[PDB]
Design a protein around this ligand. Structure first.
Ligand SMILES: Cn1c(=O)oc2cc(N)ccc21
Ligand SMILES: [Mn+2]
Ligand SMILES: [Mn+2]
Lengths: 137, 137
């Protein structure tokens, strides 16, 4: 039986700016760094950055909707989003189709998101404003 | 401050086989489905499948090392790997690291993994046998 996400591994093209982005800009905890990667945590999430010569810097119009959302509190959301904006962090989506979210890109174009709220809260919101054809189990 | 992974969203080319894969084959809980996606959970993980015509069914040689690892106990690992093998699920890598790992592909070529072991376990092993260039914090 599967019990959750053990880790998220992101392929990166340049290790140093990617470590800086996740550690310095996003505030995640850096545990170790080596010539080809780094291990960070974000709460219980184990994040691995893996240096990969195959990774390309990808504009958001060239990638699909696969994305990674990080939890942030209602009290912290707006100022964190505004700080990313003021720092010049690129974006990829503006319309809030799944609640309170800020959509932004990492240095390689990985699609990231700040989101306020749990799955239970999103299901409750969807009952009132459901997506087309929505069924709840 | 970011407090964890809020959700993982995978773009999918065909919703029905992706739901069958994550719900029926992998045993995740299906909470809701709509015309263009689904919400599932796996322990604390909130997974969203998003129907996206831009998703390509991508051979593993054509994607980078970005991947998503799910937790499983050591005791359950071999029978879950055998379940995936019975269903003909392709493997994209052999394990050569600490902790059991099974590297498998979803219907669209998303790179997945079953892994046994925590970040703390990995860091302890790395302390004893550090990777090239490894620094701890
Ligand atoms: C700046 N820095 C650091 O904090 O840990 C490192 C490890 C390596 N391999 C190279 C550079 C660093
Ligand atoms: Mn999202
Ligand atoms: Mn892995």
């Amino acid at each position: 039986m599967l019990s959750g996400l053990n880790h998220l591994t992101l392929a990166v093209s340049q290790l140093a700016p990617s470590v800086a982005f996740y550690q310095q800009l996003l505030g995640m905890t850096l545990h170790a760094r080596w010539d080809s990667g780094a291990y960070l945590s974000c709460g219980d999430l184990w994040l691995c950055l893996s240096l990969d010569p195959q990774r390309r810097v990808t504009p958001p119009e060239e990638s699909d909707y696969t994305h990674y959302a990080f939890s942030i509190s209602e009290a912290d959301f707006a100022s964190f989003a505004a700080r990313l904006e003021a720092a010049g962090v690129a974006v990829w989506k503006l319309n809030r189709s799944e609640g309170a979210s800020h959509y932004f890109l990492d240095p390689d174009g990985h699609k990231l998101e700040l989101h306020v709220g749990s799955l239970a809260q999103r299901l409750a919101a969807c009952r009132e404003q459901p997506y087309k054809g929505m069924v709840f189990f």
